[PDB]
A = this chain, B = another copy of it.
């Protein structure tokens, strides 16, 4: 009644038998842009099923020596399917998301992952270590795509802010003795009603082990983490040639 879930959107369907629940972000479900909030006058295209569907990015391995990974939205879908063509062919973009993270393990495995949504996850750097260099992150760290990027210092989230207060955003846990899926539903969060998908990323998705993975020699040592995500209430406006960046 609460540990089982089927998520159907589009031509896609996820099953889970070992769920917790669904987190609906900031108590707002995704919606479409009202005529009061809108400023642009062009008619937006609303492709219902060709972009609002579950996309599967890649698979990270939870090892003992893991530190964490982050993915930036909507950068993860700007080279993938029909979404990443409407987003390149258009200038404006608006959508929510349903993120769904998968990690399966046995009943003889232990560990926990914090799966959180951090809006406007701006990436800082070590500043040379001494704090004198005003270094900056390259493009393959702020918009790393579907491959994601490995956190160097996950205590401060590579932004000088503590991981411990990160439950103030959306989150779930994947505790392997309780659940193997983490489902968060995110609305469109920005000061503007639409924005560019290639220049601006609305939020980040952190997957950090707070408790480390452990097992005894003989069990399956490959414990994959798979990110699977669906746009929701997508909208595109301002059509011109396809530019990638």
Q: Determine the chain B residues whose CB is within 8 A of the CB of A147 once the complex forms.
A: none
C-alpha gap A187/B86 in the complex (Å): 26
Any B CB within 8 A of the CB of A49? yes
Any B CB within 8 A of the CB of A45? yes
Q: Determine the chain B residues whose CB is within 8 A of the CB of A188 once the complex forms.
A: none
Any B CB within 8 A of the CB of A85? yes
Assembly stoichiometry (copies)? 3
Interface 1/0 per residue, A1-32 and B, CB below 8 Å: 00000000001000000000000000000000
Q: A50 contacts which of B48, B81, B89 (Cβ < 8 Å)?
A: B89
Contact A82 B239 (CB under 8 A): yes
Q: A86 contacts which of B43, B46, B82, B239 (Cβ < 8 Å)?
A: B82
Any B CB within 8 A of the CB of A173? no
Any B CB within 8 A of the CB of A137? no
Q: A85 contacts which of B45, B48, B82 (Cβ < 8 Å)?
A: B82
Interface 1/0 per residue, A37-66 and B, CB below 8 Å: 000001111111110010000000000000
